[model samples]
Target: TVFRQENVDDYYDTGEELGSGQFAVVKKCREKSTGLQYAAKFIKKRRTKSSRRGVSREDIEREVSILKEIQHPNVITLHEVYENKTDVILILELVAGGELFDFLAEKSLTEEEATEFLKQILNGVYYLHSLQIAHFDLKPENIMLLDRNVPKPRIKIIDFGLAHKIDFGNEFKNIFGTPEFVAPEIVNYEPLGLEADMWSIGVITYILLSGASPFLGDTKQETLANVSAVNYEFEDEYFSNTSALAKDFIRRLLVKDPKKRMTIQDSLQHPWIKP
Candidate 1:
């Protein structure tokens, strides 16, 4: 069978294009059968016979495997996987509310709102760690919200395109993920594991509370330098409103050397979350 416009239900024409990348075009779609809404991510056909294990195809397979295994309240649920000779379809649970970056761009959240959101992010990360999966990518744009009457932002840690199983040997060979959130060890191209994800969460928490990324600089090189050099400023504004535990929490996880970085359990029990 071939995946084409003709094969799809007429009533469920692709509504809006959400994103486009090297492999797929993600679209907002609705199911005609159950009146159920979904985000249909589709990847075009590729000749697999000539190439050894298509990385894009493998990524899709891995993401599906992870989504199927993970059953947390915060994680997005995958409904179905469809395929044909020319393409693949992942019918994902549609998160109605917009992204965290959109909300941040509108205006910074108050301390109360910030903490509430941070709590969810931490809980989700903790849950992911429990499942022994490292979500290598964790950023504001990767987060989506579910609208439940009052916009209780459910953190869907997406972009599993870079996600991979953690090796107990404490090293990740693939240096692939968004640079802004990539850990120091990752930038150094050193051996890494779950701690790398903690580094990303730390960066995210800082952005959430401060309304600015601590590692931002004039250029990409400067930003990476800031991360590598540990040259970052903690605003007085951050200290004034944030608790001691919260500040310490970020510092511990953002450590340059992966060896000394805080683990997921360490972060989950931090006073900011527990208190």
Candidate 2:
């Protein structure tokens, strides 16, 4: 069922909120049945339209339905869903390790750490591609880690609020997703398909290894300019230490023309991933 406002309190006990925007507050919650924890994104309607980020109850329903239809080890699992008069309740898997971006910024990842994380991402991304799911947003903040103990950390791609299920014939023109991670074709409002996701993956890999984004500026406009003009260069320090195969893989995926971008299958075989 598309999530509705009728079962908010039943599934989770709201605790400290993780973050907040005009439409919702994501709170840490505990499920009654399994005792497992989850992040409950409670979206409350407000008077101002602009602040809502154009998210209506219908939009939330569609988002929830999208999650319901997809089941993947790498995708964030929705444990239970409930709703009440004021808001919708999304009891989702609790991602504990931390945000992928924050994780990177805090410390430089060892080669082993980076490789393992990439492998998990590759598997997850491949799964999403097989399911024809184009994760419109693929930034670090949305990629959550499950635990730090395992040799290779467990990760889940979370925050599907802007996600949509599409057919092969469908074309997307919406201007969405983070600027640094967005594909060049997306900037032109071109008829985008699944390849856009590949571009995001490439950008993500660059940041993962270098501890910085290839295209970024103090302001959003500057960043957009950098992306559009292809104003990016690899630092020698980053490239010198990174394996040739890794550099080749990033170069292939970072092509401005979406038509020429590398395929997910090819990326998997790239020495960086395969080795």
Candidate 3:
């Protein structure tokens, strides 16, 4: 709906490159008329019709459609869209701050600070759930900070490649996602929905508060086993300062059965999240 057939170069001044991926390159740019800053992600379209080459148009359109209606303080905003012969430029709100854990690694983190960050993500997820959409992949690497200099920089959820619209009566199941943080249902190829996102949130909570991954292993096999086994502990070495309510919240979230797992609404109303 936002595609612009006109030239993007005539509207904005492209600056230094901010990030890059397999067939995409994001560059910092400023609007020539309004002097507004944005990160322009240029995704190269597949030129071949026969082989596995650049990004597929199907995937690109899905990502764009998923992001178009997402409007939240904790989610990245899509400013505009432009397309040329071989590439499409998705102008996104500039998230200057780096990834979630990297910025925390430099500082002496506190439980209160962690709580603040997690709540932001919970709110974002809650909003997404109301629309029947699920971010199948929710990991530390997918979350980022908005601005590091401020006290408690706002949380920003990125990467909508795996996000999907989960309508009722549809039994969607998949085994793809980051191995370490995926839900047991995902590992077992059970029906997946919003519960998968909740499970990933539980993994993130454990890591954020304890500074250790709950189901993390050196190898993917070991990690998948740990996640599938649904085995983890709240040892004092990592949770000495954490509260009872916090662990209880996590315990409910990591349930092996997806139905029993904490829903986004349940998590938002938990004592730890409410207090």
Candidate 4:
């Protein structure tokens, strides 16, 4: 995954900023030759890192190569890569609709509507898991709508830097994830696999139904403790309008043991998703 030697500026016309974070800044850009718009991300090389993996999990080049291999409807597409002295620029398909939660809120929420979005998410996860990849990071922020103007926008999973190709034969564990959304296995530093993601999906579904985080607290420590303890419930205020099947779906995935948690395949077939 060698960075392109040519300059990004020479090929694309940069425009207004799209979004940014601690490690990268995404800006809207148009190809000078084709006029096709893209979201260009300038990522820092030194910030990437991994532990005990044969390949440098933290290598930005590895991320580039992995993304090049991925082609899925529910995943953001990386068009190309370029680099300068300090940062690497990634040209990606522009997904400008922002977070899935925000979009759903602006319009409305329901079991049917939630199912529509959740099915898309499950389909994406199912695809990634089939390839032995774990999206170590899965949250509302990583889920974005493809186009804002479309009446019913499709969601795309983004933020691939934390993604890992799971070695089924090797037991790998890491304490890396957003505290509130991470599985108990992650908090306890237990051996992890794809089941960890199902825990996050449970949390996500809970939020979608109730408009509240199932285990969030006043501080990061409290939040993490709640997650590790599997201490949460369907508050009557939040769940009175929700269905039993939905509650059962969340219960199955939020289990403390990864072995007991719902696999992506099980989740796709859950009554809440399929019925």
Which stretches in model 3 have alpha-carbon errors above 4 Å?
A: 169-175
lDDT of 4 by residue, 1-275 (tens): 46787988899999989777767889999999998999998886553345332224245675676688788999888998898766888999898888886775676368877787888889999998988878878888889998767756689988887677777722464437788799888887777788888899999899878888988999988988999999999999879988999999999999998888899999978777765
Candidates in order have lDDT scores of 0.74, 0.76, 0.85, 0.82
Give a tens-digit lDDT track for model 1, residues 95-156. 76767777678766666677777778777877887777787888888777775235345566
* lDDT (Cα) of model 4: 0.82
Clashing pairs in 2: 5-84, 6-83, 6-84, 7-83, 7-84, 8-83
Model 1 CA deviation exceeding 4 Å by range: 1-12, 44-55, 148-152, 167-171, 237-239
Q: Given candidate 3, what's the lDDT at residue 111?
A: 72
Distance from true position, residue 241, model 1, in Å?
Answer: 3.3
Model 3: per-residue Cα lDDT over 1-275, one tens digit each: 44786899999899998777678888999999899999899988888876577777776887789889999998888999998878888999888788786875776357788888899999999998988889888988778787888888898898776788888723464437889899988888888889999999999999888888898888998999999999788989989888898899899999998888889999998988886
Q: Candidate 3: give the clashing pairs.
A: none
Which pairs of residues clash in candidate 1, taking residues 3 or more apart in a chain or in different chains?
A: 171-192
lDDT for each residue of candidate 2 in 21-132, tens digit (9 for 90 to 100): 5567788988776677788877664335566453676567767877877777888877667766566767777787777877777665666787777777878878877777
* Candidate 2: C-alpha lDDT: 0.76
TM-score against native, each model: 0.87, 0.90, 0.91, 0.92
Candidate 2 lands at a TM-score of 0.90
Task: Give candidate 2 regions above 4 Å deviation.
Answer: 1-7, 45-54, 149-151
Sorted by lDDT (best first), the order is 3, 4, 2, 1
